[PDB]
Short mmCIF file of C-alpha atoms in Angstrom, two decimals:
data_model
loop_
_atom_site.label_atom_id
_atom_site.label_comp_id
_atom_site.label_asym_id
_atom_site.label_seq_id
_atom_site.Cartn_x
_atom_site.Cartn_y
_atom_site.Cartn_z
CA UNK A 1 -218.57 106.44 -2.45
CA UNK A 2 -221.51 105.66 -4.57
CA UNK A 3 -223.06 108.72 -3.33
CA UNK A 4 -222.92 112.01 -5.71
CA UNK A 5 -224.93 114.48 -7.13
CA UNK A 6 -224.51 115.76 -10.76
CA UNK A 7 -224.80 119.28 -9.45
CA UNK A 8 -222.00 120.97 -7.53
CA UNK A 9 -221.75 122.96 -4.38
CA UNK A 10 -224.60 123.42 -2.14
CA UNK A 11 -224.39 127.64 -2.47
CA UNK A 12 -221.10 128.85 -0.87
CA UNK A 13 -218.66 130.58 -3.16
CA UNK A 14 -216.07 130.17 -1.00
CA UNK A 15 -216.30 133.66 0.03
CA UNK A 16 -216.66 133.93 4.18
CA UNK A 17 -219.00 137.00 3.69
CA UNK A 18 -221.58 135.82 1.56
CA UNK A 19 -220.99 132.20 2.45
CA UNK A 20 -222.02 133.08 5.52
CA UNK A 21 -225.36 134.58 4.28
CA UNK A 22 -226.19 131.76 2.05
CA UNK A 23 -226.69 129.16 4.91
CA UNK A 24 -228.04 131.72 6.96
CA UNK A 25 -230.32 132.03 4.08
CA UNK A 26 -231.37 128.88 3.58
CA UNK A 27 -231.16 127.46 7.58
CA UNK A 28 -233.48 130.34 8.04
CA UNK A 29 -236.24 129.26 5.37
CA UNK A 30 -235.26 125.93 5.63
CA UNK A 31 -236.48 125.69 9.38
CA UNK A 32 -239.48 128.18 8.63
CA UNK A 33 -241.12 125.75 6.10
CA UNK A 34 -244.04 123.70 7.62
CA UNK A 35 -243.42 120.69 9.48
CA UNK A 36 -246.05 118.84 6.96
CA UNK A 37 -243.90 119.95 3.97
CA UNK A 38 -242.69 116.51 1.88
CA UNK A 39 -239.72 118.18 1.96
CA UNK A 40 -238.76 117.84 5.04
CA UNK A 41 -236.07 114.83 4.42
CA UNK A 42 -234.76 116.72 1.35
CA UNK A 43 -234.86 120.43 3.03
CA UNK A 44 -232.73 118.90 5.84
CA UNK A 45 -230.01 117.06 3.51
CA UNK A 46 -229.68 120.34 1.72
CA UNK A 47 -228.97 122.72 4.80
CA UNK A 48 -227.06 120.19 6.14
CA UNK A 49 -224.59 120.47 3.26
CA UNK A 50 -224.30 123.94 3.39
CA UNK A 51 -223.18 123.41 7.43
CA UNK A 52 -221.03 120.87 6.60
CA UNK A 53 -219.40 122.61 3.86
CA UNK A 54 -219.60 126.13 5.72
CA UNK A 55 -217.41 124.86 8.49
CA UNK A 56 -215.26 122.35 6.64
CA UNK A 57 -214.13 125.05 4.17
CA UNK A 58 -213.96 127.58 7.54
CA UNK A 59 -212.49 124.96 9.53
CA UNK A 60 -208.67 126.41 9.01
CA UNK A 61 -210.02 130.16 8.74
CA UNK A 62 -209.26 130.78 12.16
CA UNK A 63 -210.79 127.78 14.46
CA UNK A 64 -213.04 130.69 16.15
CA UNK A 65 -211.75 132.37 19.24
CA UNK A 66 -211.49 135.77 16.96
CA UNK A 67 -214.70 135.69 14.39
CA UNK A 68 -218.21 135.99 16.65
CA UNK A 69 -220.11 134.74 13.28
CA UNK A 70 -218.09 132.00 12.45
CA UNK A 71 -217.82 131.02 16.35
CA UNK A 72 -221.23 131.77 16.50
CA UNK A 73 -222.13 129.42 13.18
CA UNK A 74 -219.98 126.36 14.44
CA UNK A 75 -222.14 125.78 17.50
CA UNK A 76 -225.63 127.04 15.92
CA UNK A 77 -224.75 124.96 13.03
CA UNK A 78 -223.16 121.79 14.77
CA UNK A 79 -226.48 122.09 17.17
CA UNK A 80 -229.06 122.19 14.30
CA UNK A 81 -227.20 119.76 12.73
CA UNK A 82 -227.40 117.55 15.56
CA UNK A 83 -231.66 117.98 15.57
CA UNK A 84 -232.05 116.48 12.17
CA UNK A 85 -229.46 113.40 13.10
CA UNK A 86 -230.60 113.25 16.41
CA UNK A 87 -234.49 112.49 15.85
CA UNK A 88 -234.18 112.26 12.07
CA UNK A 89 -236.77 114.06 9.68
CA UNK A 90 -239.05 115.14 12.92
CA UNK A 91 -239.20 118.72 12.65
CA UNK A 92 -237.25 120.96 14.85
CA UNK A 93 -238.92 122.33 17.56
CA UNK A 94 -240.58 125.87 17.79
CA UNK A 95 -238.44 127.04 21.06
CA UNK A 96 -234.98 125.97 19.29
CA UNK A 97 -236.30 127.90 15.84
CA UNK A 98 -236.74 130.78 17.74
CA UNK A 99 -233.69 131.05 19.36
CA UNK A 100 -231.95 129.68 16.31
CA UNK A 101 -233.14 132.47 14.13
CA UNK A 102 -231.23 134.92 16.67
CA UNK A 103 -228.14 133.23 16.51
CA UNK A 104 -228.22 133.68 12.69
CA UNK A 105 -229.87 137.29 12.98
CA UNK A 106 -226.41 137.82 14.89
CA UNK A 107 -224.29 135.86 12.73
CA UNK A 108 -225.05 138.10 9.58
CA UNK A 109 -225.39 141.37 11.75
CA UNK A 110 -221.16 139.91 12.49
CA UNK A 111 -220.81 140.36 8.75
CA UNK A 112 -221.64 143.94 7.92
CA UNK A 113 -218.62 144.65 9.94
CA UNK A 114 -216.64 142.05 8.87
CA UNK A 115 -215.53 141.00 12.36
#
């Protein structure tokens, strides 16, 4: 486990309401900088941490089947996710980040009422 950054936590607070908002936060920039951005590698390591940890903190909350954001999140998250693994640091394509930015527009919307 050589692997380890000095700093701590990616953004979440633990808290499902704003936790929510952070990685909608930064999935939402993340995807909206430029596909010629050096950051691109980086960008992608840091959004995935925040799905990773979103879900993996979430993963006992309730499973989905009674939260529509956190439903929502696992499969926009786990498919997102999946781009950067799946093709590597090529950038995500324009039809998935405009659907994607629904699915969190949705996701955050679920939050204001606290489903």
């Amino acid at each position: 486990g050589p692997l380890g950054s000095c700093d701590s936590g990616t953004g979440l607070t633990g808290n499902y309401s704003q936790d929510t908002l952070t990685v909608i936060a930064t999935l939402r920039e993340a995807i909206d900088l430029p596909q010629d951005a050096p950051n691109r590698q980086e960008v992608q390591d840091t959004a995935r941490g925040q799905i990773n940890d979103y879900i993996s903190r979430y993963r006992r909350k309730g499973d989905a089947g009674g939260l529509k954001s956190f439903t929502t999140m696992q499969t926009a998250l786990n498919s997102l996710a999946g781009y950067y693994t799946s093709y590597g640091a090529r950038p995500i394509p324009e039809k998935l980040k405009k659907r994607l930015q629904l699915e969190f527009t949705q996701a955050e919307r679920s939050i204001e009422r606290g489903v």
